Coordinates of C-alpha atoms and ligand atoms in Angstrom, one line a residue:
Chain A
X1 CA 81.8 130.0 124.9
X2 CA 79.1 128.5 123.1
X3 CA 78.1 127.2 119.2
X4 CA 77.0 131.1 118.4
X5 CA 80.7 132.7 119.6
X6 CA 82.3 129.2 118.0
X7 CA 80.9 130.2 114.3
X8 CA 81.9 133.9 114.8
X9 CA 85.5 133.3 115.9
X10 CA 85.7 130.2 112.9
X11 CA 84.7 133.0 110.5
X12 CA 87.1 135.3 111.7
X13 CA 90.1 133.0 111.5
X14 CA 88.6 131.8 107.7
X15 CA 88.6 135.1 106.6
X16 CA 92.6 135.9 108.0
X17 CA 93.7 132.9 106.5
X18 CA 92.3 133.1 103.3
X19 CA 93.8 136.3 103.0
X20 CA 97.0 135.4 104.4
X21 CA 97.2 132.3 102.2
X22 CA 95.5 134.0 98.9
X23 CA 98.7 136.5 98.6
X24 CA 101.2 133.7 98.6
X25 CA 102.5 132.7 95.4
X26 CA 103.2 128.8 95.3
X27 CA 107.1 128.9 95.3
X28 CA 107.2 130.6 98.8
X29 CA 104.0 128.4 99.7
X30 CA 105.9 125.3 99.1
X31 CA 109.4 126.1 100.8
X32 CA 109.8 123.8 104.4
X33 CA 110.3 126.2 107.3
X34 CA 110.5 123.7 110.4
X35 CA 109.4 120.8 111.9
X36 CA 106.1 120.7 113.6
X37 CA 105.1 119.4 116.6
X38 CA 103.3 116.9 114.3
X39 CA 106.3 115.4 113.2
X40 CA 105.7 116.8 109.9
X41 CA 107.5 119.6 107.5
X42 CA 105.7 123.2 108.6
X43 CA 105.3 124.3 105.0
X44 CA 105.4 127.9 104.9
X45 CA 101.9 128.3 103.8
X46 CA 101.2 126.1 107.0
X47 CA 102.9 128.6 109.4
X48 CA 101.2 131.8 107.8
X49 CA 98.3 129.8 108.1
X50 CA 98.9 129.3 111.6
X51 CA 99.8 132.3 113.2
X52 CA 96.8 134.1 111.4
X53 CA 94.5 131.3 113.2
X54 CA 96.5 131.7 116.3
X55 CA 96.6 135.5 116.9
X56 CA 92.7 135.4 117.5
X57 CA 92.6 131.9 119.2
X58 CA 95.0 133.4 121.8
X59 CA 92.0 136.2 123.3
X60 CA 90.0 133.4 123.4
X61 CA 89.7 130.6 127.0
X62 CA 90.8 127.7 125.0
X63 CA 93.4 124.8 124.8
X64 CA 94.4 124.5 121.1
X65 CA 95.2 121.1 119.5
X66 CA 97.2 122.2 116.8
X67 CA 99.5 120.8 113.9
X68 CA 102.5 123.2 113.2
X69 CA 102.9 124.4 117.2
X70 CA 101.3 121.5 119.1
X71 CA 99.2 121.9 122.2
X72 CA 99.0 125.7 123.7
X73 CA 97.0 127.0 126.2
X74 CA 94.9 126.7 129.6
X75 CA 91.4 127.1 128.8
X76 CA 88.6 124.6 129.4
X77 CA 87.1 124.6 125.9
X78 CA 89.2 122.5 123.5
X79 CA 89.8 123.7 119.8
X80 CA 91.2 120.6 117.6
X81 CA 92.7 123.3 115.1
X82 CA 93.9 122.0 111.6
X83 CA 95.0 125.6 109.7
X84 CA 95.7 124.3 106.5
X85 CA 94.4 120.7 105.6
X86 CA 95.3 119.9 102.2
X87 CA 98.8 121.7 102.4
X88 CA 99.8 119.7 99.2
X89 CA 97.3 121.1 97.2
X90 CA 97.8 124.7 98.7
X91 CA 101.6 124.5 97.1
X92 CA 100.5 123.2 94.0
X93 CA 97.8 125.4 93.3
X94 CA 94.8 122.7 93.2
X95 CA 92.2 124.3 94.6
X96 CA 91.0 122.0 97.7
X97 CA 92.1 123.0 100.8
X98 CA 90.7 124.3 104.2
X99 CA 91.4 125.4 107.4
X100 CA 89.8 123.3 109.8
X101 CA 88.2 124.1 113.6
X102 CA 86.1 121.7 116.2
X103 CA 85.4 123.4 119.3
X104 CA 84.8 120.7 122.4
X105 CA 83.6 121.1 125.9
X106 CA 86.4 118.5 127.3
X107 CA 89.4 116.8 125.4
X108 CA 87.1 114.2 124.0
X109 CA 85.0 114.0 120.5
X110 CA 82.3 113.2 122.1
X111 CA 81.8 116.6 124.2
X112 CA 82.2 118.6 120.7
X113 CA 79.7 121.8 120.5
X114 CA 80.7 123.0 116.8
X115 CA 82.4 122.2 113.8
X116 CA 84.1 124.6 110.8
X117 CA 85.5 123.6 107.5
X118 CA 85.9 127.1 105.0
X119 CA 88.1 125.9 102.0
X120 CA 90.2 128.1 101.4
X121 CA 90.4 128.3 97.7
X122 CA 86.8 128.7 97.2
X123 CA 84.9 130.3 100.0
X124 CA 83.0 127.1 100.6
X125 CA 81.6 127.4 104.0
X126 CA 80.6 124.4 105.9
X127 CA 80.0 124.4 109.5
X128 CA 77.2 122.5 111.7
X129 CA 75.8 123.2 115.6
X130 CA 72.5 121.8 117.5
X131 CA 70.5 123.5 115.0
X132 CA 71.7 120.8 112.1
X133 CA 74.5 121.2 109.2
X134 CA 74.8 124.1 106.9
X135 CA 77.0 124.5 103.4
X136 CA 77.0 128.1 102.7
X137 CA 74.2 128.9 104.9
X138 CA 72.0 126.6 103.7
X139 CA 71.0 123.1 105.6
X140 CA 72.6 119.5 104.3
X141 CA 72.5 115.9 104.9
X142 CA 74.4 112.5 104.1
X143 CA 72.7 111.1 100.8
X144 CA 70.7 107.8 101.1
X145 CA 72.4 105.7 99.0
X146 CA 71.9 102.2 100.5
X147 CA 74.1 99.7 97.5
X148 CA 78.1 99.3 98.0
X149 CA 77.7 100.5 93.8
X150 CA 78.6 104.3 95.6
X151 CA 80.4 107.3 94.7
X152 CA 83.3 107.1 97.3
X153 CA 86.0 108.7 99.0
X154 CA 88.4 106.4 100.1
X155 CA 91.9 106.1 101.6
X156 CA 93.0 103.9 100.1
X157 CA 91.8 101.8 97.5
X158 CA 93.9 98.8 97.4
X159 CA 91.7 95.3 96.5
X160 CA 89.1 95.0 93.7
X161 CA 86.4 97.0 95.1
X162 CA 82.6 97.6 93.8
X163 CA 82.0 101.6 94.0
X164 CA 80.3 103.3 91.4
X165 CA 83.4 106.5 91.3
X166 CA 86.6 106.6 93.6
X167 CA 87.9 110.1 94.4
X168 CA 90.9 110.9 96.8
X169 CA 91.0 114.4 96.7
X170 CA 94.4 115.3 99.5
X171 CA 91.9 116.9 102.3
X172 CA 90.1 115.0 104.7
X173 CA 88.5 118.2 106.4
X174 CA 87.0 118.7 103.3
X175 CA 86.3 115.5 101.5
X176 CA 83.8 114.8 105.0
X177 CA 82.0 117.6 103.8
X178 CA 81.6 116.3 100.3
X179 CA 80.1 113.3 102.3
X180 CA 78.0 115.8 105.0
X181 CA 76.3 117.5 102.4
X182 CA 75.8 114.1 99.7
X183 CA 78.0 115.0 97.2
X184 CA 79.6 111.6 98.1
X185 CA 77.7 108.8 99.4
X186 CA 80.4 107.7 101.7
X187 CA 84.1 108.6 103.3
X188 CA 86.7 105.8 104.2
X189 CA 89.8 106.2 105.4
X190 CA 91.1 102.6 106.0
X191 CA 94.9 102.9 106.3
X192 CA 96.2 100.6 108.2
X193 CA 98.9 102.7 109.7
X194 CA 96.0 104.5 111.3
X195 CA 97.2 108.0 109.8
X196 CA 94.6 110.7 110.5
X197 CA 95.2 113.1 113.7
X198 CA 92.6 114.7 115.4
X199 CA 92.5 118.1 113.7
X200 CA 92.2 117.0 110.2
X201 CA 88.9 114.6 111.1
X202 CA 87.2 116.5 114.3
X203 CA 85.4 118.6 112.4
X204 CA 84.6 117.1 109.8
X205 CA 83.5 114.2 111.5
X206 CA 80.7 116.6 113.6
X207 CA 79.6 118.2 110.4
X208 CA 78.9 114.7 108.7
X209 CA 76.7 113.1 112.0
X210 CA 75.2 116.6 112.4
X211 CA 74.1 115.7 108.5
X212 CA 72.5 112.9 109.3
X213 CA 75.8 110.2 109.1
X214 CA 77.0 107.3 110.8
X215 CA 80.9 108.2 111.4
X216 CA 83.0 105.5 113.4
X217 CA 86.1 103.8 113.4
X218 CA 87.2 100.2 111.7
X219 CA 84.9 98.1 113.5
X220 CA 82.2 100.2 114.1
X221 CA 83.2 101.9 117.3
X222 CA 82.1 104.8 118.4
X223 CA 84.6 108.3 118.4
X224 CA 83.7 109.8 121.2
X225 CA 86.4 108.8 123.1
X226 CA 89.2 110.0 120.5
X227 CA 91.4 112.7 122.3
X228 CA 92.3 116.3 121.1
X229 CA 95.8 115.2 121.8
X230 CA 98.6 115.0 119.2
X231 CA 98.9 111.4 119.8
X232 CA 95.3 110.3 118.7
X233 CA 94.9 108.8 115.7
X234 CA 92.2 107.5 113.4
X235 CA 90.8 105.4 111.1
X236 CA 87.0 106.4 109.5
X237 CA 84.3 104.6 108.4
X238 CA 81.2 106.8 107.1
X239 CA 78.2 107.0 105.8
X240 CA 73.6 106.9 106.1
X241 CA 73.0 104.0 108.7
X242 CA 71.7 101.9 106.0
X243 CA 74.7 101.9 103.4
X244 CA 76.9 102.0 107.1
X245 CA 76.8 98.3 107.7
X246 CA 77.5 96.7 104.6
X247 CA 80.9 98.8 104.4
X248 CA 81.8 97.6 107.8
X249 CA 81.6 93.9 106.5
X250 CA 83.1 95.3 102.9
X251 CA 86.5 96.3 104.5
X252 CA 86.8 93.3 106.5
Chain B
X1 CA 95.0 126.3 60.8
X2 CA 98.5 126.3 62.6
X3 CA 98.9 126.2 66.7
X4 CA 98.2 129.7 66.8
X5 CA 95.1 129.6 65.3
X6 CA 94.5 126.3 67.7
X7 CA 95.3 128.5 70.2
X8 CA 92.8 131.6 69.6
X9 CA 89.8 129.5 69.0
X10 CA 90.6 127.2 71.9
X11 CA 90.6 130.7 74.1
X12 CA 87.3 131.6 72.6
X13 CA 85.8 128.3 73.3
X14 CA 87.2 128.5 76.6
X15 CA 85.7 131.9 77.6
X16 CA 82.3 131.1 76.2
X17 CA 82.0 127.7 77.9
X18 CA 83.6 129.3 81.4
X19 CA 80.7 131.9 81.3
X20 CA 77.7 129.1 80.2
X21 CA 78.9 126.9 83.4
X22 CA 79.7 129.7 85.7
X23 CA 75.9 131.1 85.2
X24 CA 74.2 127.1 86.0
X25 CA 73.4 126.6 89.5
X26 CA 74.0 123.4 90.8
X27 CA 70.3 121.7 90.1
X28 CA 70.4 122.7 87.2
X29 CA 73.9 121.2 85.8
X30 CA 72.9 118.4 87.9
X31 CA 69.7 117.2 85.6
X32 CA 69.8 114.6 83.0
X33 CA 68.6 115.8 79.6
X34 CA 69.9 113.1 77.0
X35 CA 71.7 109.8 76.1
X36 CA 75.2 111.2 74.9
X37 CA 76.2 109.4 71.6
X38 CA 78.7 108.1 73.8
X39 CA 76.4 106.1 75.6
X40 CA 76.4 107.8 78.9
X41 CA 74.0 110.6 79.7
X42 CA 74.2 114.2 79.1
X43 CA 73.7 116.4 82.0
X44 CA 72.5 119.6 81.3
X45 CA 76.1 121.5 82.2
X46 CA 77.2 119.4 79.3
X47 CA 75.1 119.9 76.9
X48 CA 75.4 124.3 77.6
X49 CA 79.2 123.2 77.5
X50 CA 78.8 121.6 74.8
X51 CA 76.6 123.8 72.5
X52 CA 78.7 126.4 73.7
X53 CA 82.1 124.9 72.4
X54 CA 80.4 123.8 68.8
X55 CA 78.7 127.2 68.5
X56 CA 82.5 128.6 67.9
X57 CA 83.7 125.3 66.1
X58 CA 81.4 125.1 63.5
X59 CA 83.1 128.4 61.7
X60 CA 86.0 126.0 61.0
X61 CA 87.2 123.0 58.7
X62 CA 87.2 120.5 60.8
X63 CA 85.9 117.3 62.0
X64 CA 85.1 117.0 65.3
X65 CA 84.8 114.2 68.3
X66 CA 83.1 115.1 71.2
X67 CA 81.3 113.1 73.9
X68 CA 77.7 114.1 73.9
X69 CA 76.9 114.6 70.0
X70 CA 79.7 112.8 68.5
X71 CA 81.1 112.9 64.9
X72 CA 80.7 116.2 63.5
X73 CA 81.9 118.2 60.6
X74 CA 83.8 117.2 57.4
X75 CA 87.0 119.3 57.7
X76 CA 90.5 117.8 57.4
X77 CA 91.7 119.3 61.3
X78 CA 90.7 116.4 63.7
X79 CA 89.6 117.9 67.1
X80 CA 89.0 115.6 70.1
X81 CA 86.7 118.0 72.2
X82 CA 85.6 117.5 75.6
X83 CA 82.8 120.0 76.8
X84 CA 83.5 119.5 80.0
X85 CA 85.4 116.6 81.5
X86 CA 85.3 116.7 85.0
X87 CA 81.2 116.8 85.2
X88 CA 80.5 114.7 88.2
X89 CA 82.8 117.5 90.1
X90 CA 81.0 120.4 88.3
X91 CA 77.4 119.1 89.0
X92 CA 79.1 119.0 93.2
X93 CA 80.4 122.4 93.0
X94 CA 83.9 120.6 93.2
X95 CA 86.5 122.8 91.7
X96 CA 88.6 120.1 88.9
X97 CA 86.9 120.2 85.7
X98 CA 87.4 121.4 82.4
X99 CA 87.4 121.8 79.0
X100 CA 89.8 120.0 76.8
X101 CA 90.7 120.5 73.2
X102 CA 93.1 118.3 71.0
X103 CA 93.9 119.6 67.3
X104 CA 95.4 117.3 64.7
X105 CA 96.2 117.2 61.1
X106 CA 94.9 113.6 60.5
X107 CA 92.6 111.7 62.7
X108 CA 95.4 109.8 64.8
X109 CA 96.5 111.2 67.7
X110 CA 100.3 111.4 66.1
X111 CA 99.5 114.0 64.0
X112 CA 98.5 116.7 66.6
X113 CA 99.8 120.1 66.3
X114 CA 98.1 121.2 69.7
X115 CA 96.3 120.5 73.2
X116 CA 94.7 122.8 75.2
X117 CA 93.3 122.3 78.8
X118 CA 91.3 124.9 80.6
X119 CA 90.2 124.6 84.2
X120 CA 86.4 126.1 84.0
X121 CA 86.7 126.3 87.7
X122 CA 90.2 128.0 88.7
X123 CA 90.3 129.6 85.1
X124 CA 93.9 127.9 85.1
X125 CA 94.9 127.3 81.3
X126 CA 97.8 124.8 80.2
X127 CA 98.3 124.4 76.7
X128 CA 101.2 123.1 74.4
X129 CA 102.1 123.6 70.7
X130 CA 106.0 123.3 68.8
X131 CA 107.2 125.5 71.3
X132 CA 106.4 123.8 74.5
X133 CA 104.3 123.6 77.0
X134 CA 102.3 126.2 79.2
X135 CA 100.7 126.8 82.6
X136 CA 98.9 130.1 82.2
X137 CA 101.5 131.9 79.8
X138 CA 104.5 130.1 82.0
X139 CA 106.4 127.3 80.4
X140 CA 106.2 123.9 82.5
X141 CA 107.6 120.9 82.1
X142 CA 107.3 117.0 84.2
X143 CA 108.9 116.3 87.6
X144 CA 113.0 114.8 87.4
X145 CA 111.6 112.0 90.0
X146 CA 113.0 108.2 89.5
X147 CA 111.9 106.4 92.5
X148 CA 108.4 104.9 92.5
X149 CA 107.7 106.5 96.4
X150 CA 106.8 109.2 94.5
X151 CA 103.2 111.6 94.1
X152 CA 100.7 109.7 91.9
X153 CA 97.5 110.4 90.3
X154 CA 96.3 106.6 89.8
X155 CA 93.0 105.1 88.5
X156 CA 92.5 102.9 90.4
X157 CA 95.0 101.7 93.0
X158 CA 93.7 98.1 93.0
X159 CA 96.7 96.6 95.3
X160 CA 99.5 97.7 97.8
X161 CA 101.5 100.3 95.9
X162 CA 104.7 102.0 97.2
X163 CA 104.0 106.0 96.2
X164 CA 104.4 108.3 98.4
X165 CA 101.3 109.6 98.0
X166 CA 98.3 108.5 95.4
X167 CA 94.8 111.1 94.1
X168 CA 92.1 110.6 91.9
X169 CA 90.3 114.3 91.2
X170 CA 87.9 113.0 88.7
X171 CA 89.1 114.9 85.5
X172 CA 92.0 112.8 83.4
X173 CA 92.5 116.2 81.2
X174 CA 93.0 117.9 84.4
X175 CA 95.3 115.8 85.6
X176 CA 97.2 114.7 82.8
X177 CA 97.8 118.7 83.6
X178 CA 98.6 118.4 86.9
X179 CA 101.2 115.8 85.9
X180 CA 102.6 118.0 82.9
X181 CA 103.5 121.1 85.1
X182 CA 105.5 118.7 87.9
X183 CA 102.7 119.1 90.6
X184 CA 102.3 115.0 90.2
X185 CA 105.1 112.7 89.5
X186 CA 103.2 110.7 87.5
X187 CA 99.4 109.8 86.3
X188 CA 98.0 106.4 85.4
X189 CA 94.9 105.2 84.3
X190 CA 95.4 101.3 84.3
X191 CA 91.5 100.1 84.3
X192 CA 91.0 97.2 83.2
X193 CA 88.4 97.6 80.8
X194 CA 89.9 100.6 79.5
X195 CA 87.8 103.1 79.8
X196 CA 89.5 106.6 78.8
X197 CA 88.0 108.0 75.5
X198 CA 90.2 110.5 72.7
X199 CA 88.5 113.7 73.8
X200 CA 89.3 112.6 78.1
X201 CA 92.9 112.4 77.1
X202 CA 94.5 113.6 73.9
X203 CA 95.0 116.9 74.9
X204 CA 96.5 116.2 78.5
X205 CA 98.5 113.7 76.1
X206 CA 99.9 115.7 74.2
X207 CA 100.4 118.9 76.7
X208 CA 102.7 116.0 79.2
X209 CA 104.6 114.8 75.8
X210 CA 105.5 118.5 75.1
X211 CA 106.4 119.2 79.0
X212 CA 108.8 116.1 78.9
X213 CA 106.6 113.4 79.7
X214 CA 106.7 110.0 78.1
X215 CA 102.9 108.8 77.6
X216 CA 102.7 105.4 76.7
X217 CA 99.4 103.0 76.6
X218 CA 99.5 99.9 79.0
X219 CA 102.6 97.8 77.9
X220 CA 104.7 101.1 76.9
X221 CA 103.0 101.3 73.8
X222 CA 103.0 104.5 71.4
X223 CA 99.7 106.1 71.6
X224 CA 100.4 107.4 68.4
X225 CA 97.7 105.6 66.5
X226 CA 95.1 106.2 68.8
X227 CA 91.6 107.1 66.9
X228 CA 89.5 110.4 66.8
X229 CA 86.5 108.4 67.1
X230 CA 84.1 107.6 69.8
X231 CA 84.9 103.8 69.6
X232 CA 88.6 104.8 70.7
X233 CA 89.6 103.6 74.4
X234 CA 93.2 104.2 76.2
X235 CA 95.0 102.7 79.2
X236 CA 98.0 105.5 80.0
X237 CA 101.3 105.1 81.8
X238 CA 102.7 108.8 82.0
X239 CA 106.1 109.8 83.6
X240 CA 109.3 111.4 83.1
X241 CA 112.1 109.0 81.3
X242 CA 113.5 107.1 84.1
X243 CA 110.5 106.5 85.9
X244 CA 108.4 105.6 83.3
X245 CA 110.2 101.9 83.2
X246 CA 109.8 101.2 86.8
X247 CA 105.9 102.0 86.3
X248 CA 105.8 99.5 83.7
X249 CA 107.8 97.0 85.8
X250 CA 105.3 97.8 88.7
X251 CA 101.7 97.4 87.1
X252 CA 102.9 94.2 85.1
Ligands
LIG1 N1 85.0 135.6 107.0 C1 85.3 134.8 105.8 C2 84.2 133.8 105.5 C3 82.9 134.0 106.3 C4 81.7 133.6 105.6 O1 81.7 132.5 105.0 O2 80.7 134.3 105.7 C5 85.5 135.8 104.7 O3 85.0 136.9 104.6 O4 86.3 135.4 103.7
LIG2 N1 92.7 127.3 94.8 C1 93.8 127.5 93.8 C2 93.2 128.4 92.7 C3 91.7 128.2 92.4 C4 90.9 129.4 92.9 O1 91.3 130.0 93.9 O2 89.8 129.6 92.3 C5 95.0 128.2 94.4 O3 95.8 127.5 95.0 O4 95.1 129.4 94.5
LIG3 N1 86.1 132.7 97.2 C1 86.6 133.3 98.4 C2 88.1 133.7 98.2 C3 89.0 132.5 98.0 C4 90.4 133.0 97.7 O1 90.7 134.2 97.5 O2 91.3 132.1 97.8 C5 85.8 134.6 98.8 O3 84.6 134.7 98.5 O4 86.3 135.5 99.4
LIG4 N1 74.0 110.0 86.1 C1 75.2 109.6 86.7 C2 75.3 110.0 88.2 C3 76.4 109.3 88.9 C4 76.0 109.1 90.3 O1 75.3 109.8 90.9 O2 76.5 108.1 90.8 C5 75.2 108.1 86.8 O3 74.6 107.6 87.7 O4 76.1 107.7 86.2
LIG5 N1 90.7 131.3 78.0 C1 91.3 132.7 78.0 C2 90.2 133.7 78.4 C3 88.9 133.1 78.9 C4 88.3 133.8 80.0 O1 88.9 134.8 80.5 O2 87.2 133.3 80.5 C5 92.5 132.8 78.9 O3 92.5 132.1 80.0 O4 93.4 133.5 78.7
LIG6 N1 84.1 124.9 91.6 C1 83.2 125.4 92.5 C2 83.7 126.7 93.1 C3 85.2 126.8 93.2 C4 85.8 128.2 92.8 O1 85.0 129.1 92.6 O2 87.0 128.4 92.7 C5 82.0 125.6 91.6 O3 81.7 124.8 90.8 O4 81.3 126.6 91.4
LIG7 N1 88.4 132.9 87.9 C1 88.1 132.7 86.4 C2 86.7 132.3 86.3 C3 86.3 131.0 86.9 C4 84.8 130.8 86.8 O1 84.1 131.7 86.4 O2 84.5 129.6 87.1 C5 88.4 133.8 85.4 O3 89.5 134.4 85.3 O4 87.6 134.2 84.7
LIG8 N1 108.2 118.0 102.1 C1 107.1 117.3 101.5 C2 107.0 117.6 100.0 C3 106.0 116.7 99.3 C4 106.6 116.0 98.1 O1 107.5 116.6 97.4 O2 106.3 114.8 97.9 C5 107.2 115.8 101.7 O3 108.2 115.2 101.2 O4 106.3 115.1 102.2
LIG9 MG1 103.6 119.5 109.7
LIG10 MG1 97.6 120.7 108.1
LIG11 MG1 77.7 111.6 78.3
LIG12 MG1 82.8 115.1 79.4

């Protein structure tokens, strides 16, 4: 498999999901049918989600990494498979959440060929390869805002801090992309818990350094080693190499 | 003019403002084209917003507050107009922003007859008049939560906080929404330097009063003799009776 068969298979999953998800009203959206693998409440939305994702990841050679179900298959290319991030928005009808795909050539980050975010509520295509970052077929990159005074996404605010705007918008997937394609100047997520699994950041990790940004954990490390297990977690730090830095001492 | 003439020119405004932003690319909504007489700029989707709104307000006897012109009008119906709140999101392509329209019979906001909140975006519409309040044609009303591990929607989480979980979208008449219709548990804005104008807020006001929520300012003050002017600034503590005490208790 490479980047080329990567974006066709991401597009076909968007385009079963959105479908699958866009004739759901909210009431049956909403309505707990399990527990995933996760740990988590499979929200119904989450399982139709899913199993729409998983009928054409199943013809492919991969091992999925996935929420709702939890690790499934043999194949040598690893897929760390978020099928709905955002599933609190999804029930409530606020419109930004996305189905989620990095494809990797081992179980780690750091041999990742291809990244897919498609939000699901508006069609919003993002997606990156060796050829760069793209938002609806069109090239992006981080912005180059270099001052702390920065519109940010963080998780979560909680000291006096010195950012121009702070947004928290309920999908990580997504809100990297906002930061990929400079619509934010930065993304944190800073919980101390250390809450993010590997399918909601993979992918929107790639897409932001494919943009041009500096992604890493707390203290600067790198995330190459972070496993498409169900165990990994993560904490994010990101944004242009200049502005980079002085968050990493900010957050201290 | 009664609530249901409120309501037919609010609809108007909202189609003719829906259509001016829907048409702007990006760049375009993006560029600065004047100092609004509120003393931040005017970008050029809120000035089309804008011109769009007055276009179908100036045919009626009122005076009205809105953020990029101002004070206009002489009529003796008050209405707290925002063109397009939300406009950092709409210049991104970020799907939370809106148009917001507060009607009252004197220039406080305790006089209102009606609020109306349309999502330029999602073309979701909430509005409220004596019979109640609406999410597209459906009545709504707040969340029955009481514990404070709840969903909030909280500028700006400035310390640990208990909620379950906290968002920031970027559009306080949007969210004051997402509040009214039970989506969130509760919505604060608890800046310090109080920076929420009457046109960002009276309608959401006024929608969450008529779904159930209490609205108070800071302390659990009435925000009933809050000013349509552009010198007006609110702090808000909104929730359903029996959490809206622990809120107070929590922020003090
Ligand atoms: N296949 C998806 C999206 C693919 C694309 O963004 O071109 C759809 O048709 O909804
Ligand atoms: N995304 C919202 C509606 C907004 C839209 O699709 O334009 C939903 O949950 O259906
Ligand atoms: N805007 C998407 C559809 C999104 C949805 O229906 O939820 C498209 O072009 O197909
Ligand atoms: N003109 C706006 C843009 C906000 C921004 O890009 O941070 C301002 O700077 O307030
Ligand atoms: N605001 C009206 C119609 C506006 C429009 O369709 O653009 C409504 O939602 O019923
Ligand atoms: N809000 C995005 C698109 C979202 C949608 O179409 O639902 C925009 O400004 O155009
Ligand atoms: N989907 C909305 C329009 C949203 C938009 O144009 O931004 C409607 O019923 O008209
Ligand atoms: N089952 C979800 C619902 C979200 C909510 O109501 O807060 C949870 O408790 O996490
Ligand atoms: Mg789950
Ligand atoms: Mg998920
Ligand atoms: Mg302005
Ligand atoms: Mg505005």
């Amino acid at each position: 498999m490479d980047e080329r068969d990567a974006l066709r298979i991401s597009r076909e999953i968007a385009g079963e999901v959105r479908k699958a998800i866009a004739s759901m009203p909210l009431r049956e959206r909403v309505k707990d049918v399990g527990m995933g693998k996760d740990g988590t409440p499979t929200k119904a939305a989450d399982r139709v989600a899913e199993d729409a994702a998983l009928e054409i990841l199943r013809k492919e050679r991969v091992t999925v990494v996935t929420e709702e179900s939890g690790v499934l298959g043999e194949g040598d290319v690893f897929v760390a498979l978020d099928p709905l991030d955002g599933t609190f928005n999804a029930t409530r009808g606020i419109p930004v959440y996305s189905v989620s795909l990095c494809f990797s050539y081992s179980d780690k980050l750091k041999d990742a060929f291809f990244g897919y975010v498609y939000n699901l509520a508006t069609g919003d295509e993002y997606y990156a390869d060796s050829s760069g970052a793209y938002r609806n077929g069109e090239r992006i990159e981080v912005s180059d805002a270099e001052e702390l005074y920065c519109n940010a996404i963080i998780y979560y605010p909680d000291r006096k801090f010195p950012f121009k705007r702070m947004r928290i918008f309920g999908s990580a997937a997504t809100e990297l992309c906002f930061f990929a394609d400079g619509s934010f100047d930065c993304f944190l997520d800073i919980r101390p818990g250390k809450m993010l699994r590997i399918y909601d950041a993979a992918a929107g990790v790639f897409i932001a350094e494919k943009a041009g940004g500096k992604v890493t954990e707390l203290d600067g490390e790198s995330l190459g080693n972070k496993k498409f297990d169900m165990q990994e977690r993560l904490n994010i730090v990101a944004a242009n190499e200049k502005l980079h830095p002085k968050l990493l001492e900010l957050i201290k």
